[PDB]
Design an enzyme around this catalytic site. Sequence first.
Site, PDB file in Angstrom:
ATOM      1  N   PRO A 200      -8.674  -3.077  14.451  1.00 57.49           N
ATOM      2  CA  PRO A 200      -8.229  -1.695  14.632  1.00 57.49           C
ATOM      3  C   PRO A 200      -7.508  -1.105  13.438  1.00 57.49           C
ATOM      4  CG  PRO A 200      -8.026  -2.848  16.689  1.00 57.49           C
ATOM      5  CD  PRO A 200      -8.384  -3.894  15.647  1.00 57.49           C
TER       6      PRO A 200
ATOM      7  N   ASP B 118     -11.579  -1.536   3.786  1.00 53.96           N
ATOM      8  CA  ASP B 118     -11.555  -2.893   3.213  1.00 53.96           C
ATOM      9  C   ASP B 118     -12.847  -3.671   3.437  1.00 53.96           C
ATOM     10  OD1 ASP B 118      -8.890  -2.481   2.471  1.00 53.96           O
ATOM     11  OD2 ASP B 118      -8.155  -3.289   4.379  1.00 53.96           O
TER      12      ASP B 118
ATOM     13  N   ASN C 139      -7.967  -1.690  10.395  1.00 54.40           N
ATOM     14  CA  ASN C 139      -8.873  -1.419   9.291  1.00 54.40           C
ATOM     15  C   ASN C 139      -9.882  -0.328   9.607  1.00 54.40           C
ATOM     16  OD1 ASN C 139      -7.659  -3.377   7.714  1.00 54.40           O
ATOM     17  ND2 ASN C 139      -9.104  -4.988   8.358  1.00 54.40           N
TER      18      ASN C 139
ATOM     19  N   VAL D 165       0.832  -1.196   0.000  1.00 50.68           N
ATOM     20  CA  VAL D 165       0.000   0.000   0.000  1.00 50.68           C
ATOM     21  C   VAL D 165       0.865   1.244   0.000  1.00 50.68           C
ATOM     22  CG1 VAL D 165      -1.977   1.137   1.030  1.00 50.68           C
ATOM     23  CG2 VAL D 165      -1.528  -1.295   1.487  1.00 50.68           C
TER      24      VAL D 165
ATOM     25  N   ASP E 143     -13.461  -8.980   8.295  1.00 51.12           N
ATOM     26  CA  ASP E 143     -12.145  -8.920   8.912  1.00 51.12           C
ATOM     27  C   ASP E 143     -11.893  -7.605   9.619  1.00 51.12           C
ATOM     28  OD1 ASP E 143      -9.630  -9.864   9.641  1.00 51.12           O
ATOM     29  OD2 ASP E 143      -8.700  -9.137   7.790  1.00 51.12           O
TER      30      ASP E 143
END
Length: 294
Positions: free
Chosen positions: A126, A141, A128, A18, A123
């Site tokens: 924290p 996500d 995400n 990323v 999923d």
Amino acid sequence: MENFQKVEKIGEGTYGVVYKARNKLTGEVVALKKIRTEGVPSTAIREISLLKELNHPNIVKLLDVIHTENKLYLVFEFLHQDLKKFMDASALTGIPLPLIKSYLFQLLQGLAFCHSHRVLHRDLKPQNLLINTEGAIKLADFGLARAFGVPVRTYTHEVVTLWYRAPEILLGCKYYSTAVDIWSLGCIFAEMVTRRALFPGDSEIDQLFRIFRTLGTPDEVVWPGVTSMPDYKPSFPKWARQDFSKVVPPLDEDGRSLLSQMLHYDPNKRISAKAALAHPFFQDVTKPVPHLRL
Ligand SMILES: NC(=O)c1cc([N+](=O)[O-])c(Cl)cc1NCc1cnc(N)nc1
């Protein structure tokens, strides 16, 4: 690609690398995730593309999906920090209750929205959950895990975090329901409050047993059908449920009540995001400004 001037590598995201990048044309700063492979499934393309229309203030906007040369690029709205870093930074003093409540409320609004549109996150953790200076928190996500089985090891063979995984997933259920997200969010709520992960398992069985040690080994009384789950074993030790006031002290009863409903074993008894929004815990919710040091 060449249309994006890389600013810095954000990290080894769940699926790939990323980067914080700037669109040379628009000047827009975005998060660019490169995903891995025999040409990248076309099934995922239709799926991912659908998530572009999943727009909500508490959902990180998916700006574009780009499949090209065996590479899949996801372009997202950029936010400077995630909740994991923020919790670490607030470790000594703790996140003030008003802010914990605002974040929980906003996350439930985001989940309520996704769930009403039949999109599961699957999923939540924290890392995400992204935050900004305005006091907003957003789910990142979301519907990605759908056309990507179950996580395990990122490209850099990094360890998959099971800390927020719902028990039905650990017990081998083949069909996830919206309830899995409520469970993960309950685990995150507890962590913001206590400043310690609720169930920090380091293996699937350790994760499961940590849950059992705290909430009690589930049985047919509290979870009808649990003894017939794929990975359920009659040999599981039988732990008694711990007094709840011991789990997230010094959280008040409104908070403990909501958390208990977010952590019910039976996915069908687990509170929905919509219902949780109406819980008395949010009677005095506000939207505080966090102290972010970017
Ligand atoms: N949408 C985003 O802004 C974003 C996306 C991804 N991602 O798609 O994987 C990741 Cl890791 C982090 C993000 N932002 C938080 C952040 C920003 N900067 C630094 N240094 N660390 C974290």
